[PDB]
Protein backbone atom coordinates (compact mmCIF):
# COMPACT_ATOMS: atom_id res chain seq x y z
CA UNK A 1 0.00 0.00 0.00
CA UNK A 2 0.59 3.81 -0.02
CA UNK A 3 1.44 6.47 2.64
CA UNK A 4 -1.53 7.86 4.60
CA UNK A 5 -1.53 11.52 5.79
CA UNK A 6 -0.84 12.20 9.49
CA UNK A 7 -2.51 14.80 11.72
CA UNK A 8 -0.66 18.04 12.33
CA UNK A 9 -0.86 19.55 15.79
CA UNK A 10 -3.38 22.37 15.70
CA UNK A 11 -2.19 24.45 18.65
CA UNK A 12 1.42 25.54 18.74
CA UNK A 13 3.76 28.52 18.87
CA UNK A 14 7.18 28.91 17.31
CA UNK A 15 9.05 31.03 14.76
CA UNK A 16 8.73 31.60 11.06
CA UNK A 17 10.79 32.78 8.13
CA UNK A 18 8.49 33.82 5.29
CA UNK A 19 9.65 34.49 1.69
CA UNK A 20 7.33 36.38 -0.66
CA UNK A 21 8.02 36.96 -4.31
CA UNK A 22 6.01 40.19 -4.47
CA UNK A 23 8.78 41.79 -2.37
CA UNK A 24 11.36 39.12 -3.15
CA UNK A 25 12.32 39.15 0.56
CA UNK A 26 12.46 37.16 3.81
CA UNK A 27 10.60 38.23 6.96
CA UNK A 28 11.30 36.79 10.38
CA UNK A 29 8.55 36.59 12.94
CA UNK A 30 7.20 34.91 16.03
CA UNK A 31 4.08 32.93 15.17
CA UNK A 32 1.24 31.75 17.45
CA UNK A 33 -1.01 29.28 15.58
CA UNK A 34 -4.37 28.36 17.09
CA UNK A 35 -6.16 26.25 14.54
CA UNK A 36 -8.77 25.16 17.07
CA UNK A 37 -9.98 28.79 17.26
CA UNK A 38 -9.11 29.61 13.60
CA UNK A 39 -6.87 32.43 14.71
CA UNK A 40 -3.24 33.32 14.28
CA UNK A 41 -0.89 36.00 15.67
CA UNK A 42 2.50 36.99 14.23
CA UNK A 43 5.18 39.40 15.54
CA UNK A 44 7.92 40.78 13.26
CA UNK A 45 11.55 40.15 14.22
CA UNK A 46 14.43 42.20 12.93
CA UNK A 47 17.34 40.05 11.74
CA UNK A 48 20.06 42.66 11.85
CA UNK A 49 19.62 46.38 12.03
CA UNK A 50 20.04 46.80 8.25
CA UNK A 51 16.53 47.25 6.72
CA UNK A 52 14.65 49.35 9.39
CA UNK A 53 11.58 47.46 8.27
CA UNK A 54 9.31 48.89 11.05
CA UNK A 55 8.21 45.96 13.20
CA UNK A 56 4.51 45.10 13.34
CA UNK A 57 2.18 42.64 15.07
CA UNK A 58 -0.70 41.13 13.11
CA UNK A 59 -3.70 39.40 14.71
CA UNK A 60 -5.96 37.41 12.40
CA UNK A 61 -9.42 36.37 13.65
CA UNK A 62 -11.10 34.21 11.01
CA UNK A 63 -14.06 33.35 13.23
CA UNK A 64 -14.87 37.03 12.85
CA UNK A 65 -13.74 38.52 9.60
CA UNK A 66 -10.95 40.73 10.71
CA UNK A 67 -7.29 41.37 11.26
CA UNK A 68 -5.41 44.04 13.17
CA UNK A 69 -2.01 45.49 12.29
CA UNK A 70 -0.23 47.12 15.26
CA UNK A 71 2.93 49.22 15.19
CA UNK A 72 5.15 47.62 17.76
CA UNK A 73 6.43 51.02 18.95
CA UNK A 74 3.46 53.41 18.81
CA UNK A 75 0.88 50.59 19.07
CA UNK A 76 -1.32 52.43 16.57
CA UNK A 77 -3.81 50.08 14.95
CA UNK A 78 -5.28 49.29 11.51
CA UNK A 79 -8.43 47.19 11.10
CA UNK A 80 -8.41 45.20 7.83
CA UNK A 81 -11.25 43.09 6.53
CA UNK A 82 -10.34 39.47 5.92
CA UNK A 83 -11.51 38.26 2.55
CA UNK A 84 -10.01 34.88 1.69
CA UNK A 85 -11.14 32.00 3.94
CA UNK A 86 -9.46 30.07 6.71
CA UNK A 87 -6.83 27.64 5.37
CA UNK A 88 -5.36 25.46 8.15
CA UNK A 89 -1.78 24.26 8.68
CA UNK A 90 -2.39 20.57 8.08
CA UNK A 91 -2.20 18.05 5.26
CA UNK A 92 -5.74 17.48 3.97
CA UNK A 93 -6.68 13.91 3.13
CA UNK A 94 -7.36 14.64 -0.59
CA UNK A 95 -3.70 15.70 -0.93
CA UNK A 96 -1.33 13.53 -2.98
CA UNK A 97 2.05 12.28 -1.74
CA UNK A 98 5.14 13.64 -3.53
CA UNK A 99 8.25 12.58 -1.66
CA UNK A 100 9.97 11.50 1.55
CA UNK A 101 13.28 13.21 2.39
CA UNK A 102 15.72 13.20 5.27
CA UNK A 103 17.16 16.51 6.41
CA UNK A 104 20.59 16.84 7.92
CA UNK A 105 22.92 13.92 7.77
CA UNK A 106 23.56 10.38 8.96
CA UNK A 107 24.03 10.98 12.64
CA UNK A 108 21.46 13.76 13.40
CA UNK A 109 18.42 13.71 11.07
CA UNK A 110 14.63 13.86 10.76
CA UNK A 111 12.49 12.24 8.09
CA UNK A 112 9.93 14.47 6.37
CA UNK A 113 7.26 14.05 3.71
CA UNK A 114 6.25 16.39 0.94
CA UNK A 115 2.56 16.49 0.03
CA UNK A 116 0.73 18.42 -2.66
CA UNK A 117 -2.89 19.49 -2.48
CA UNK A 118 -2.92 21.68 -5.64
CA UNK A 119 -5.88 23.51 -3.99
CA UNK A 120 -4.49 26.61 -10.77
CA UNK A 121 -2.94 27.70 -7.45
CA UNK A 122 -1.01 24.76 -6.01
CA UNK A 123 -0.10 24.19 -2.36
CA UNK A 124 2.81 21.99 -1.24
CA UNK A 125 3.64 21.26 2.39
CA UNK A 126 6.48 19.43 4.09
CA UNK A 127 5.68 17.84 7.49
CA UNK A 128 7.71 15.46 9.68
CA UNK A 129 7.12 11.68 9.64
CA UNK A 130 7.04 10.67 13.28
CA UNK A 131 4.75 13.37 14.70
CA UNK A 132 3.63 15.50 11.74
CA UNK A 133 5.19 18.88 12.74
CA UNK A 134 5.20 21.49 9.95
CA UNK A 135 8.55 22.46 8.47
CA UNK A 136 7.65 24.26 5.31
CA UNK A 137 4.74 25.50 3.26
CA UNK A 138 4.82 26.73 -0.35
CA UNK A 139 1.97 28.32 -2.36
CA UNK A 140 2.59 28.62 -6.10
CA UNK A 141 0.62 29.99 -9.06
CA UNK A 142 1.21 28.33 -12.45
CA UNK A 143 4.43 26.77 -11.16
CA UNK A 144 6.05 29.93 -9.75
CA UNK A 145 6.41 30.71 -6.08
CA UNK A 146 4.18 33.47 -4.78
CA UNK A 147 4.86 32.60 -1.13
CA UNK A 148 6.73 30.08 0.99
CA UNK A 149 7.29 29.98 4.71
CA UNK A 150 9.52 27.95 7.07
CA UNK A 151 8.69 26.97 10.67
CA UNK A 152 10.91 26.09 13.62
CA UNK A 153 11.28 26.21 17.40
CA UNK A 154 7.78 24.76 17.63
CA UNK A 155 6.28 23.98 21.00
CA UNK A 156 2.76 22.70 21.44
CA UNK A 157 -0.11 24.63 22.96
CA UNK A 158 -0.44 28.36 23.58
CA UNK A 159 1.37 29.72 26.67
CA UNK A 160 -0.45 33.06 27.13
CA UNK A 161 -3.64 33.44 25.06
CA UNK A 162 -3.73 37.23 25.58
CA UNK A 163 -1.60 37.37 22.39
CA UNK A 164 -4.91 37.03 20.55
CA UNK A 165 -6.66 39.95 22.34
CA UNK A 166 -5.90 43.25 20.50
CA UNK A 167 -4.60 46.29 22.41
CA UNK A 168 -6.73 49.16 23.62
CA UNK A 169 -5.98 51.17 20.45
CA UNK A 170 -7.80 48.67 18.27
CA UNK A 171 -11.09 49.52 19.99
CA UNK A 172 -11.56 52.11 17.23
CA UNK A 173 -8.63 52.08 14.79
CA UNK A 174 -8.31 53.26 11.24
CA UNK A 175 -9.53 51.13 8.35
CA UNK A 176 -6.92 51.90 5.70
CA UNK A 177 -3.68 49.92 6.22
CA UNK A 178 -0.27 51.14 7.44
CA UNK A 179 3.06 51.28 5.61
CA UNK A 180 6.05 49.09 6.42
CA UNK A 181 8.97 51.48 5.84
CA UNK A 182 11.07 53.98 7.80
CA UNK B 1 30.45 33.23 20.88
CA UNK B 2 29.60 30.38 18.45
CA UNK B 3 32.51 29.03 16.42
CA UNK B 4 31.78 27.69 12.89
CA UNK B 5 31.86 23.90 12.50
CA UNK B 6 33.41 22.06 9.57
CA UNK B 7 31.13 20.89 6.77
CA UNK B 8 31.72 17.50 5.15
CA UNK B 9 33.52 18.05 1.86
CA UNK B 10 32.40 14.92 0.05
CA UNK B 11 28.79 13.83 -0.12
CA UNK B 12 25.96 13.00 -2.48
CA UNK B 13 22.26 13.58 -2.02
CA UNK B 14 19.33 15.53 -3.51
CA UNK B 15 18.63 19.22 -4.00
CA UNK B 16 15.67 21.51 -4.53
CA UNK B 17 16.85 24.73 -6.16
CA UNK B 18 14.68 27.87 -6.30
CA UNK B 19 15.62 30.56 -8.80
CA UNK B 20 14.03 33.99 -8.85
CA UNK B 21 14.91 34.53 -12.49
CA UNK B 22 12.57 31.64 -13.28
CA UNK B 23 10.58 31.93 -10.08
CA UNK B 24 10.61 28.12 -9.90
CA UNK B 25 11.82 25.03 -8.01
CA UNK B 26 13.88 22.30 -9.71
CA UNK B 27 14.68 18.94 -8.17
CA UNK B 28 17.94 17.12 -8.92
CA UNK B 29 20.50 14.62 -7.70
CA UNK B 30 23.74 16.20 -6.47
CA UNK B 31 27.20 14.76 -6.02
CA UNK B 32 29.41 17.32 -4.21
CA UNK B 33 33.21 16.84 -4.20
CA UNK B 34 34.83 19.92 -2.63
CA UNK B 35 38.06 18.05 -2.17
CA UNK B 36 38.32 17.95 -5.97
CA UNK B 37 36.51 21.31 -6.51
CA UNK B 38 33.88 19.66 -8.69
CA UNK B 39 30.15 19.11 -8.58
CA UNK B 40 27.68 17.05 -10.63
CA UNK B 41 23.90 17.41 -10.74
CA UNK B 42 21.21 15.35 -12.48
CA UNK B 43 17.75 16.82 -13.07
CA UNK B 44 14.66 15.07 -11.81
CA UNK B 45 11.16 15.81 -13.04
CA UNK B 46 8.43 16.45 -10.46
CA UNK B 47 5.49 15.12 -12.47
CA UNK B 48 4.94 14.82 -16.24
CA UNK B 49 3.43 18.37 -16.22
CA UNK B 50 6.34 20.67 -17.35
CA UNK B 51 8.25 18.72 -20.10
CA UNK B 52 11.23 20.68 -18.82
CA UNK B 53 13.75 18.44 -20.68
CA UNK B 54 16.13 16.81 -18.17
CA UNK B 55 19.80 17.68 -18.07
CA UNK B 56 22.99 16.59 -16.36
CA UNK B 57 25.53 19.25 -15.51
CA UNK B 58 29.14 18.43 -14.63
CA UNK B 59 31.27 21.24 -13.18
CA UNK B 60 35.07 20.82 -13.11
CA UNK B 61 36.43 24.01 -11.52
CA UNK B 62 40.02 22.78 -11.52
CA UNK B 63 39.86 22.67 -15.35
CA UNK B 64 37.63 25.76 -15.48
CA UNK B 65 34.83 24.16 -17.54
CA UNK B 66 31.31 22.82 -17.31
CA UNK B 67 29.27 20.49 -19.50
CA UNK B 68 25.51 20.45 -20.01
CA UNK B 69 24.28 17.06 -21.27
CA UNK B 70 20.85 16.08 -22.57
CA UNK B 71 19.73 13.06 -20.61
CA UNK B 72 17.98 11.62 -23.66
CA UNK B 73 20.21 12.24 -26.70
CA UNK B 74 23.37 12.82 -24.58
CA UNK B 75 24.32 15.86 -26.72
CA UNK B 76 26.86 18.06 -24.94
CA UNK B 77 27.59 21.78 -24.36
CA UNK B 78 31.01 23.05 -23.18
CA UNK B 79 30.79 26.38 -21.37
CA UNK B 80 33.81 28.03 -19.82
CA UNK B 81 33.56 28.56 -16.08
CA UNK B 82 33.92 32.16 -14.95
CA UNK B 83 33.02 32.83 -11.33
CA UNK B 84 35.37 31.10 -8.89
CA UNK B 85 34.92 28.02 -6.76
CA UNK B 86 32.80 28.52 -3.60
CA UNK B 87 32.67 25.44 -1.32
CA UNK B 88 29.64 24.32 0.67
CA UNK B 89 30.99 25.40 4.05
CA UNK B 90 30.72 28.25 6.51
CA UNK B 91 33.83 30.42 6.10
CA UNK B 92 35.52 31.74 9.20
CA UNK B 93 34.83 35.42 8.38
CA UNK B 94 31.08 34.61 8.63
CA UNK B 95 28.87 36.03 11.36
CA UNK B 96 26.33 33.97 13.35
CA UNK B 97 22.64 34.84 12.93
CA UNK B 98 20.29 32.42 14.71
CA UNK B 99 19.90 28.86 15.98
CA UNK B 100 16.65 27.03 15.17
CA UNK B 101 15.23 23.60 15.85
CA UNK B 102 13.40 21.93 12.98
CA UNK B 103 10.49 19.60 13.41
CA UNK B 104 9.09 19.38 16.84
CA UNK B 105 10.02 17.82 20.13
CA UNK B 106 11.72 14.40 20.00
CA UNK B 107 12.12 14.25 16.18
CA UNK B 108 14.25 17.33 15.81
CA UNK B 109 17.54 18.66 14.56
CA UNK B 110 19.23 21.81 15.80
CA UNK B 111 20.63 24.06 13.07
CA UNK B 112 22.63 27.27 12.93
CA UNK B 113 22.17 30.10 10.46
CA UNK B 114 25.37 31.86 9.39
CA UNK B 115 25.96 34.83 7.10
CA UNK B 116 29.10 35.74 5.23
CA UNK B 117 27.63 38.74 3.35
CA UNK B 118 30.59 38.38 0.90
CA UNK B 119 30.52 41.76 -0.87
CA UNK B 120 33.13 41.81 -3.69
CA UNK B 121 31.89 45.45 -3.96
CA UNK B 122 28.23 44.65 -4.97
CA UNK B 123 26.97 43.70 -1.47
CA UNK B 124 25.75 40.20 -2.32
CA UNK B 125 24.94 38.48 0.96
CA UNK B 126 25.24 34.71 1.44
CA UNK B 127 23.23 32.92 4.11
CA UNK B 128 23.61 29.22 4.91
CA UNK B 129 21.91 26.91 7.40
CA UNK B 130 24.02 24.00 8.68
CA UNK B 131 23.43 21.40 11.33
CA UNK B 132 24.82 21.99 14.81
CA UNK B 133 26.15 18.57 15.88
CA UNK B 134 28.00 17.52 12.68
CA UNK B 135 27.67 20.53 10.30
CA UNK B 136 25.60 18.96 7.47
CA UNK B 137 24.25 21.51 4.96
CA UNK B 138 20.48 21.99 4.87
CA UNK B 139 20.01 25.25 3.01
CA UNK B 140 21.86 27.90 1.02
CA UNK B 141 20.52 31.32 -0.05
CA UNK B 142 22.30 33.96 -2.17
CA UNK B 143 20.78 37.44 -2.25
CA UNK B 144 21.76 40.70 -3.94
CA UNK B 145 20.48 43.87 -2.26
CA UNK B 146 18.12 41.96 0.03
CA UNK B 147 16.09 40.01 -2.57
CA UNK B 148 16.48 36.32 -3.15
CA UNK B 149 18.18 35.53 -6.41
CA UNK B 150 18.78 31.87 -5.59
CA UNK B 151 18.27 29.35 -2.83
CA UNK B 152 18.75 25.63 -2.63
CA UNK B 153 17.69 22.95 -0.12
CA UNK B 154 19.65 19.75 0.45
CA UNK B 155 18.53 16.38 1.80
CA UNK B 156 19.19 12.63 1.69
CA UNK B 157 22.87 13.32 2.24
CA UNK B 158 25.29 10.43 2.46
CA UNK B 159 29.02 10.99 2.83
CA UNK B 160 31.61 10.20 0.20
CA UNK B 161 31.03 9.50 -3.49
CA UNK B 162 29.84 5.99 -4.36
CA UNK B 163 30.79 5.81 -8.05
CA UNK B 164 33.11 8.66 -9.08
CA UNK B 165 32.66 7.99 -12.76
CA UNK B 166 29.75 10.50 -12.53
CA UNK B 167 32.45 13.13 -12.92
CA UNK B 168 33.89 11.81 -16.21
CA UNK B 169 31.86 13.34 -19.08
CA UNK B 170 30.28 11.05 -21.67
CA UNK B 171 32.11 10.23 -24.86
CA UNK B 172 30.28 13.11 -26.62
CA UNK B 173 31.73 15.90 -24.48
CA UNK B 174 35.28 15.39 -25.79
CA UNK B 175 34.45 18.13 -28.34
CA UNK B 176 31.07 19.68 -27.48
CA UNK B 177 28.73 22.37 -28.85
CA UNK B 178 30.64 25.27 -27.16
CA UNK B 179 27.48 27.43 -26.66
CA UNK B 180 24.36 27.04 -24.52
CA UNK B 181 21.43 24.83 -25.55
CA UNK B 182 17.76 25.29 -24.60
CA UNK B 183 15.76 23.48 -21.90
CA UNK B 184 12.32 23.13 -23.46
CA UNK B 185 10.13 20.62 -25.28
Residue numbers in the entry:
A (entry chain B): 37 to 155, 160 to 222
B (entry chain A): 38 to 222
Question: What is the paper's account of this structure, in its own sentences?
Answer:
EPDR1 contains a single glycosylation site at residue Asn130 of loop L7 on the back-side of the glove. In the structure of glycosylated EPDR1, the hydrophobic grooves from the two monomers each contain a long continuous tube of electron density, which can be due to a copurifying lipid or a PEG molecule contributed from the crystallization solution. We were not able to identify copurifying lipids by mass spectroscopy. The buried ligand is in van der Waals contact with the hydrophobic side chains of residues M54, L67, Y69, V76, V78, Y94, L96, Y98, M103 on shelf-I, F179, I181, I186, L187, F191 on shelf-II and W122 and L125 in L7. The rim of the groove is rich in charged and polar residues and there is a notable clustering of the conserved, exposed polar side chains D123, K155 and E161 at one end of the groove. Structures of EPDR1 with and without an unexpected bound ligand, likely to be a PEG molecule from the crystallization condition, identify an elongated, surface-exposed hydrophobic binding groove in each chain of the homodimer. All three of the crystallographically independent EPDR1 homodimers (one dimer from crystals of the glycosylated protein, and two dimers from crystals of the deglycosylated protein) are similar to each other with Cα RSMDs less than 0.6 Å, indicating little variability within the chains and across the homodimer interface.
EPDR1 is a member of the ependymin-related (EPDR) family of proteins. Two EPDR1 chains associate into a tight homodimer through extensive hydrophilic contacts between the convex surfaces of shelf-II. At acidic pH, EPDR1 can bind to liposomes that contain the anionic lipid bis-monoacylglycero-phosphate (BMP) or the ganglioside GM1, consistent with a role in the degradation or transport of lipids and/or lipoproteins within the lysosome.
